[PDB]
Amino acid sequence: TLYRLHEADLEIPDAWQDQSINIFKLPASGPAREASFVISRDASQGDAPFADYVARQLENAEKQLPGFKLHKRWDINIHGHAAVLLDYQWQREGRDLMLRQVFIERRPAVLITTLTTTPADLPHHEPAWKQAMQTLVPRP
Amino acid sequence: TLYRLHEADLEIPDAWQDQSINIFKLPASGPAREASFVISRDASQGDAPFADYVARQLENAEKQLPGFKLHKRWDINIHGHAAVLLDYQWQREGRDLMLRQVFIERRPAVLITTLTTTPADLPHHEPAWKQAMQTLVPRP
Amino acid sequence: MDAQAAARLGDEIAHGFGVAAMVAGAVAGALIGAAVVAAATGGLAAVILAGSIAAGG
């Protein structure tokens, strides 16, 4: 069970539980502030279908984030993998936060991409985010 | 920067600063409780020699980790890269934690592997930890 | 996936409060390593706690 990371290869036993989180801080650009781009994994899906799995993610996000409300949703395919893209809004300590989140169906775990910014700053960070996602090639 | 992860490849602007963390939880086994194996990156080195960078890491750990106790320092080698192995222990909420931390010199950032367990449980997980680190090949 | 935490994490790292940003290499790895061994949580939850730990000190 060889594990591949940007800087090395190594053998990890399968008894070990993967909880890895890829993290990038986006630099400020023009009027917009720093953003973050995070890649997380999820194994909770199980046998439930992607649509109902994706379904359950909003149900939890909609009760747990103060001031939640959903701006957009895509259903697209990334290199044969089903993907849903969500644009939604929530307030942490009275300041408007915007999330752009993509769920990529995969096993043993669903890939999740999360961009955090503000509604105001999303257009300024969107070009670089578009670069990142148009290049995402899942492995078979 | 084309960035590779375990599950996909994607292109990342160079202005994004990487803070990615690989995390593996070693499951509980027999008398031993669960342990953790973590791969982190540190781009702080700048121009200082590697041997002095480790020292800066030691001084910081003694200053900020409560109950720091150094057990071993190992100036070793990993597939052509200078490496230092640290065995130390610190206290977290009355619980003694035994750490085994490896610093692998690389650019643009030092690769760091950290095993967290208990002094009693360390010998149990040392085989699995020894397995992984002997398999690590830094990638060009 | 905890939307609570992904939002908290993405917010914290944007504002320079990520673990790897506030403490030295050895310490960030050690704080992350303790969080995972200490609940039905995941990597996101762990990284958050590592930063709360790092911040309280």
Author numbering:
A (entry chain B), B (entry chain A): 2 to 141
C (entry chain C): 1 to 38, 41 to 59
Pull text from the paper.
One such pathway is the type VI secretion system (T6SS), which in many bacterial species functions to deliver antibacterial effector proteins from the cytoplasm directly into an adjacent bacterial cell via a one-step secretion event. In contrast, DUF1795 proteins, also known as effector-associated gene (Eag) chaperones, interact with so-called ‘evolved’ PAAR proteins in which the PAAR and toxin domains are found as a single polypeptide chain. Crystal structures of Eag chaperones in complex with the TMDs of cognate class I and class II effectors reveal the conformation of effector TMDs prior to their secretion and insertion into target cell membranes. Given that the Eag chaperone dimer creates a hydrophobic environment with complementary knob-hole interactions for its cognate effector TM helices, and interacts with TM helices via side chain to main chain hydrogen bonds, we conclude that Eag chaperones provide an environment that mimics transmembrane helical packing to stabilize prePAAR effector TMDs in the cytoplasm prior to effector export from the cell.
The structure of the EagT6 chaperone was previously solved as part of a structural genomics effort and we were additionally able to obtain a 2.60 Å co-crystal structure of this chaperone in complex with the N-terminal prePAAR and first TMD region of the class II effector Tse6 (Tse6NT). A comparison of the chaperone structures in their apo and effector-bound states shows that upon effector binding, both chaperones ‘grip’ the prePAAR-TMD region of their cognate effector in a claw-like manner. By contrast, Tse6NT exhibits a pseudosymmetric binding mode with EagT6. In this structure, two alpha-helices of Tse6 each occupy equivalent Eag binding pockets and run in the opposite direction to match the antiparallel arrangement of the EagT6 dimer. For example, A7 and A30 of Tse6 interact with equivalent sites in their respective chaperone protomers. These two helices, which consist of prePAAR and a TM helix, flank a central TM helix whose C-terminus extends into the solvent, likely indicating the location of the downstream PAAR domain in the full-length effector. By contrast, we were able to model the entire prePAAR motif of Tse6NT and in this case, the motif forms an alpha helix that binds the hydrophobic pocket of an EagT6 protomer. In this structure, the two conserved alanine residues of prePAAR make contact with the EagT6 chaperone, whereas the arginine, aspartate and histidine residues are solvent exposed. It should be noted that the modelled conformation of Tse6NT appears to be locked into place by crystal packing, suggesting that in solution Tse6’s prePAAR motif may exhibit significant conformational flexibility and can dissociate from EagT6 as is observed for the prePAAR motif of Rhs1. For example, I22 and I24 of EagT6 create a hydrophobic surface in the ‘palm’ of the claw, which is flanked on either side by symmetrical hydrophobic surfaces comprised of A62, L66, L98, F104, and I113.
